[PDB]
């Protein structure tokens, strides 16, 4: 079918085939269009004409200019070979590597999985980084938002996040850099290649990376997100696997589609923000989960739109949210790396129930002496230390021990740790806790528990602190 | 759906929505002349008062403006099935924009591909032809008394600025 | 013509309605009957939306609207080193004709990943602050943001002309072309600034692509991204370009007026989605770049003037989300006096220190941390008062850093100065020494190692940072000289 | 002190040559403007080259 | 069109006409001059009231020492 | 050539020119109207058809009723022979002196001068009020945006100003009352008449009026800048003048704009403010300048729409002044009279060499301790009305002095304020507070430089007090 550009208000570009107009998210290709232009319907507008979208950027276009509808949806590549491969959202390598070679092609719309195929309860997640476990328990094809500070070595914890699992556990990782800023992208990729976690030598770097930054129609940026996750479904059902999908942002991705919207002609609901911010929002969301085939758990990086979240979208996000990443740039600036928030880092899954009930317990009897430690902060603050009890004193050191147990070194920055970074086996980890609680090392110096891997390390490390 | 039939002329869109269709209306059966005529002739024929504009008064309502210019179909003697689309622009208002619909329509025969030339031209003609510009040449290429107050004079104007707008 | 033209639709608001050109390409700009342009931007089912960007007592309906059958390009060259254009690129300093008869289509992409390359380039403004605690870089983008003259303009004239040095810097990613686009800026004002500019004659590096507020609005909005397009130039010419957009607040104004104009949705906060993207093509089409493509750069200082607090506005909150930091200005300072205005504490340079010089990490880590420290502090008592002595020291000292990221306007400055004079404060030098004697010793002392030790400063420089040596000489110097200042 | 002075005269013969230049021109172009199109041919003359349009532009 | 060259013929002819009758604004009459000779005068403010045809030069001479 | 009244939606007048459309711009006379009712063309709309807006009132219109149009824009009378004749924007008289009678005319539309032709350099217009001179230092020829509370000392200020400076002043001055309400023009008048700056034996008198008040419709208001700018574009280039400009209200104009804006079928831009408010702003703000044949010295009030800034209009404003005195309305709050913004009491002819640093930092100084005792509020809110550390005791009271010293009789309002105002020349005035400052005055009681000029007259008052 080819249809002929009837009207072009920007990237809207409505299109009269007086040849089939086949349903709406076809990918239609523009027929004079050097590069390669789709165009997604979006509407069927009626009168032989459809609505598009271009997905891409407009110029020397003429009405009347044919498109030869792809007669689908935009496919693009699934398959290893993005694993290592920068492609935008077309997919097309913009790793500016040549090509990918994929013969696997999926159109990026995809659903949530039919109801009985749901693996019903969703299990742990297990980060390996004692304390994020810890104190946020993911769940496998969970939902992590990340609210934090910035090139903290945000991407640093990725990195070493995809590392830590994603290698370990033998799962996959996908990075959709999401309008972001081809320079942060750019800034990544090296070191991720840096990192080696990248690999130019192995597409099977950790991550397959799809980038659709801020430059593209917000739809289209919006649709890299799509595309990411088509490929970690591949990943996940094809592949068997956990996969991790790493999103920065899911916000601009809101905001991409709330760009649409008006100039859809919709009304867009609050904030100006699509009504349909929600369905948008359900169904990606909603294709994520745990198949039985595998899991994504979803990393979602979350700006914080208006330093709220109240903002309806991310509200409603919580809902999807189950484990939160709350970056602690406090725990960073006292040197603490892992730098996480951990009284606001929490999963929901968080349970005794489930993630067992003493993990639970320590978790819970930590966190609330931990608060109870932060609490103390505050009164030793102001009241200097020793003009209370030495329970006080005991735990402030244990609490501050375990902090410091907490603190895990990191694995490809020797350069900026001068240690090497450890995965934690989580058993190991609970009992870790549940002892430096327990108090059982109270001789011991709390600068050893600084940058420990897992606890037996940590009483390694305890005993070369300890001369 | 239907076959669309979008020959030059054309409206696309703008009320003659109703031209497209009979476009392809004209087109299948090739009463293209046909009806192409039967407009002009109704053309007046309607747009005059003459119990037309009385019937184009809103105050007469549909109740029987289907029943006496549809009947004008039938009062008149058209109608292969023009009228019917006229008891279209009937209830759609469009009989009043009708001469601009037909226009579109017909221009006339080859005529509903016609052109009129401009930049540096004078000159009012419609062309019908294949390749064209020849047939201008020689229609300026005619006559030579001529006008000029039939378009352009490049003369006051073309390049009498000119030097001007160097300085 | 058979047909080379097309008729105005319909006309208002300098917003053309066109008749006819379908056969049109997209995004050309044609031209009216009148000589005046027109952009076509929505070529719509039976117009062509084009924006007029004359007057439209100028123009009337069924105008012949001919094609130009173009897209813009704008002239390209570097002749407009030494110019003054408008948007376009057409002489409007009143110099006669430009020199840019080179020519390219503004439509440019932004560098690819691989033809990106990070920053490890500083780039310097002297501006004593600036350079210290959000150490200026190459090839970025960076929101100047502040209220209703802030010197707003003063701040990065002084910095423009502190690129002056910077062409007499003859490395030549070290030399560097400047880019002035006036967002809807008075005649007048410009005037004066140019007015500056030619005082300062950094001009001849320079273009100003000057957009007063006359301009027509698409006008106003192309001229960044024509000026993006010449700098893009440079640095594909391993050419170093600032740019500095002053103001995309105007800009977006423009934008939208445009858009509501076109009848076409805007958006957020009554703005354009786009304009979002707008500008986001724009700066993407900022880089650093690698150094294979001549690696130039085209730096971007995109200015806002806040309204206050209204960051939340949707274009701030936009740039905020693009941008690679932003100076908060703090008017209050310099209400206080203090001036540099800066609200350092929420200014951000979201880079730091690959834009950093050692040099300036040496002196300034721990100032940047002090003032940190340093800055909770002041911000408590004052209260007639204050209590223990360490911190006391840290405000003492503060205040006097505080001088030292101040900077009169008119007043660009070398890093090297900035350093050395860093150098003695965070040496916990001046502290000692009481404020309004602090600005006293600082020019004396500068001009002193100018004078003195321009041997050595000339080693500082020399090494490009402070050699322990260096320091070791520094810190003599300055000890007797911070001596000398006194008794 | 020299240059200053050198400018002006300079300045001022530059500054009364488009002074007279435009209204030159205006006095020029609107006399011989009047005349012309008496011979129409200045009309036909072009036509003829038009007619090199018509023809010689496709 | 067509005429190219016979339209600036047309332009041509006053231009020399003027030159070889030289006198006051040029067939302008007064209406030029009463602008040119306001022009003049500012431009002088410029520059100051310095005479334009004298060559300057003077003696320079010393202040306190130590 | 003709049109009908097609259409007529409020004072949009849609023109069905039934013979071709002319110009946009145009000036339509209707006619049989009633009198002159100008219709300016607005757009094309097509069909022949043209929105038009009417200037005038819409009562009394055949949906039919033959115009003729004026195929140009206005020719208005531009010459001398206004000064002192009060027009309405139409050009035509309002001073009912019979006919004002000029012999040039003019499209109301008129140009922007170029960047070329930049003058480039302006040069402090001073008042000899202190605050003026201190804190918002004019240029001459510089656009000064009164941004102040309604009408208020607003209005009283520019009067007295013009007292100052345009009498001082040997060049001529306009004054524009935009959408101002007749009475106070009147007034106006009558204290020009009184003074005689309004000479009725001279009407080339030192000041012309334009009165183009709410009342009219609103193309009227809407136009009357451009009128009010032609005849100063005249007065100014012509003869040469230093006009001084009167734009009472921009902001009446704005507001006018922004009204019109949905029913010129255009939507506005935000909160109703018209869309193409920038390029409104460009045209007119441009169009003024201080040309190289003379200045167009502009004290234009500017209402400060809700006192709110953010407001986009205001904030579009700013970048076309030069001067820019926001009065506060906390301060006038404070009975203080001059009751000004100090801090935004401002030039952009400010920043340290701009005017200066004597001034500027006295004036930061100033500011500082002003500000500081802001600051220093918040421990009084905490501490009391005589209790803080004694040396902020002192700056404090500088401050309550210095404010009180800022505070000055007024001429025109000694009517009310039962005391005349004063001249307090620039050095003494700088000076004054460099006193002050100086602490040199310590001794004395602030509330002696309560209302003064002068500031020995306020040490004066010390003493009348006591």
Not at chain 1, 4 to 17: N, S
Not at chain 1, 100 to 114: G, L, V
Not at chain 1, 338 to 350: E, F, G, K, Q
Not at chain 4, 11 to 22: F, H, L
Request: hydrophobic residues 40%.
């Amino acid at each position: 079918t080819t249809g002929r550009i009837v009207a072009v208000i920007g990237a809207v570009v409505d299109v009269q085939f007086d040849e089939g107009l086949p349903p709406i998210l076809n990918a239609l290709e523009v027929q004079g269009r050097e590069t390669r232009l789709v165009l997604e319907v979006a509407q069927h507008l009626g009168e032989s004409t459809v609505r598009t979208i271009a997905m891409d950027g407009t110029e020397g276009l003429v009405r009347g200019q044919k498109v030869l509808d792809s007669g689908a949806p935009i496919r693009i590549p699934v398959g290893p070979e993005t694993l290592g491969r920068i492609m935008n959202v077309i997919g097309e390598p913009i790793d500016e590597r040549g090509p990918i070679k994929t013969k696997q092609f999926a159109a990026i719309h995809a659903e949530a999985p039919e109801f009985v195929e749901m693996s019903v309860e969703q299990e742990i997640l297990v980060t390996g980084i004692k304390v994020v476990d810890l104190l946020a328990p993911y769940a496998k094809g969970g939902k992590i938002g990340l609210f934090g500070g910035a090139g903290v070595g945000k991407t640093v914890l990725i990195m070493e996040l995809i590392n830590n699992v994603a290698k370990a556990h033998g799962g996959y990782s996908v990075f959709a850099g999401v309008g972001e800023r081809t320079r942060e992208g750019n800034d990544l990729y090296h070191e991720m290649i840096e990192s080696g976690v990248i690999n130019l030598k192995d597409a099977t770097s950790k991550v397959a990376l799809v980038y659709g930054q801020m430059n593209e129609p917000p739809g289209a940026r919006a649709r890299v997100a799509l595309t990411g996750l088509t490929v970690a479904e591949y990943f996940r059902d094809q592949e068997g696997q956990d996969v991790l999908l790493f999103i920065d942002n899911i916000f601009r991705f809101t905001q991409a589609g709330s760009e649409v919207s008006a100039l859809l002609g919709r009304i867009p609901s609050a904030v100006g923000y699509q009504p349909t911010l929600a369905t948008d929002m359900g169904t990606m969301q909603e294709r994520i989960t745990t198949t039985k085939k595998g899991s994504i758990t979803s990393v979602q990086a979350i700006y914080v739109p208006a330093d709220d979240l109240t903002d309806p979208a991310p509200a409603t996000t919580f809902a999807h949210l189950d484990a939160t990443t709350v970056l602690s740039r406090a725990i960073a600036e006292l040197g603490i790396y892992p730098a996480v928030d951990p009284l606001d880092s929490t999963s929901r899954i968080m349970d005794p129930n489930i993630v067992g009930s003493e993990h639970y317990d320590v978790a819970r009897g930590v966190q609330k002496i931990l608060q109870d430690y932060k609490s103390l902060q505050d009164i030793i603050a102001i009241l200097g230390m020793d003009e209370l009890s030495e329970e006080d004193k005991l735990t402030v050191s244990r609490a501050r021990k375990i902090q410091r147990f907490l603190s895990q070194p990191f694995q490809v920055a020797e350069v900026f740790t001068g240690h090497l970074g450890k995965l934690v086996p989580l058993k190991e980890t609970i009992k870790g806790f549940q002892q430096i609680l327990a108090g059982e090392y109270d001789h011991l110096p709390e600068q050893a528990f600084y940058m420990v891997g897992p606890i037996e390390e940590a009483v390694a490390k305890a005993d070369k602190l300890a001369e | 759906f239907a076959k669309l039939v979008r020959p030059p002329v054309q409206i696309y869109g703008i009320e003659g929505r109703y031209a497209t269709a009979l476009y392809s209306a004209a087109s299948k059966q090739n009463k293209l002349e046909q009806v192409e005529k039967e407009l002009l002739r109704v053309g007046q024929i309607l747009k005059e008062p003459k119990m037309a504009a009385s019937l184009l008064n809103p105050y007469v309502k549909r109740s029987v403006k289907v029943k006496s210019l549809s009947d004008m179909t039938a009062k008149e003697k058209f109608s292969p099935l023009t009228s019917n689309l006229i008891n279209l622009l009937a209830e759609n208002g469009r009989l009043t924009n009708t001469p601009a619909v037909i226009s579109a329509f017909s221009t006339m025969m080859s005529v509903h591909r016609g052109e009129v030339p401009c930049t540096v031209t004078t000159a009012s003609a419609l062309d019908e032809t294949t390749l064209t510009e020849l047939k201008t040449v020689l229609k300026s290429f005619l006559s030579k008394g001529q006008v000029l107050k039939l378009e352009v004079k490049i003369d006051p104007s073309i390049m009498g600025g000119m030097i001007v707008r160097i300085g | 013509d058979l047909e080379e033209t097309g008729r105005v639709l319909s006309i208002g608001d300098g917003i053309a309605r066109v008749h006819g050109l379908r056969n049109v390409q997209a995004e050309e700009m044609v031209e009216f009957s009148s000589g005046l342009k027109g952009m076509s931007l929505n070529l719509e089912p039976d117009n062509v939306g084009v924006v007029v960007f004359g007057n439209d007592k100028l123009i009337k309906e069924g105008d012949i609207v001919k094609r130009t059958g173009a897209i813009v390009d704008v002239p390209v060259g570097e002749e407009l080193l030494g110019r003054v254009v408008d948007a376009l690129g057409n002489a409007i300093d009143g110099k006669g004709p430009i020199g840019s008869k080179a020519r390219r289509r503004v439509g440019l992409k932004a560098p690819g990943i691989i033809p990106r390359i990070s920053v490890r380039e500083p780039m310097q403004t002297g501006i004593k602050a600036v350079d210290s605690l959000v150490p200026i870089g190459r090839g970025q983008r960076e929101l100047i943001i502040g209220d209703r003259q802030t010197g707003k303009t003063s701040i990065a004239i002084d910095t423009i002309i502190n690129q002056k040095r910077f062409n007499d810097g003859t490395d030549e990613k070290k030399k560097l072309y400047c880019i002035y686009v006036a967002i809807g800026q008075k005649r007048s004002t410009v005037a004066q600034l140019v007015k500056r500019l030619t005082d300062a004659d950094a001009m001849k590096y320079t273009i100003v692509v000057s957009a007063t507020a006359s301009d027509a609005a698409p006008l106003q909005y192309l001229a960044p991204y024509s000026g993006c397009s010449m700098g893009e130039y440079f640095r594909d010419n391993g050419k170093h370009a600032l740019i500095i957009y002053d103001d995309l607040s105007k800009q977006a104004v423009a934008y939208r007026q445009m858009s509501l104009l076109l009848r076409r949705p805007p958006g957020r906060e009554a703005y354009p989605g786009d304009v979002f993207y707008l500008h986001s093509r724009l700066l993407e089409r900022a880089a650093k770049m690698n150094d294979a493509f001549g690696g130039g750069s085209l730096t971007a200082l995109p200015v806002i003037e806040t309204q206050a607090g209204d960051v939340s506005a949707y274009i701030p909150t936009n740039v905020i989300s693009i941008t690679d930091g932003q100076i908060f200005l703090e008017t209050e300072l310099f209400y206080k006096g203090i001036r540099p205005a800066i609200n350092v504490g929420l200014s951000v340079s979201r880079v730091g220190s690959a834009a950093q010089t050692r040099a300036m990490k040496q002196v300034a880590g721990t100032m940047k941390l002090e003032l940190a420290q340093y800055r909770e502090v002041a911000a408590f008592a004052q209260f007639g008062s204050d209590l223990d002595a360490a911190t006391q020291q840290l405000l003492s000292r503060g205040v006097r850093l505080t001088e030292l990221l101040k900077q009169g306007q008119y007043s660009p400055m070398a890093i090297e100065e900035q350093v050395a004079v860093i150098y003695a404060g965070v040496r916990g030098y001046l502290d000692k020494l009481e404020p309004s004697k602090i600005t006293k010793f600082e020019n004396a002392f500068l001009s002193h190692v100018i004078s003195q030790h321009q041997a050595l400063l000339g080693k500082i420089r020399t090494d490009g940072k402070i050699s322990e040596e260096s320091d070791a000489k520094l810190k003599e110097i300055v000890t007797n000289f911070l001596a000398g200042f006194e008794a | 002190e020299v240059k200053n002075r050198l400018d002006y005269h300079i300045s001022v013969q530059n500054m009364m040559r488009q002074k007279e230049q435009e209204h030159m021109i205006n006095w020029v172009e609107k006399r011989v403007v009047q005349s012309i199109s008496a011979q129409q041919e200045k009309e036909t003359i072009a036509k003829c080259i038009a007619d090199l349009k018509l023809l010689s532009k496709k | 069109l067509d005429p190219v060259q016979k339209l600036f013929v047309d332009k041509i002819r006053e231009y020399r006409t003027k030159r070889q009758t030289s006198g006051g604004p040029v067939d302008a009459g007064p209406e030029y001059q009463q602008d040119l000779d306001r022009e003049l005068f500012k431009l002088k403010q410029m520059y100051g009231k310095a005479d334009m045809n004298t060559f300057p030069n003077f003696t320079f001479e010393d202040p306190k020492f130590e």
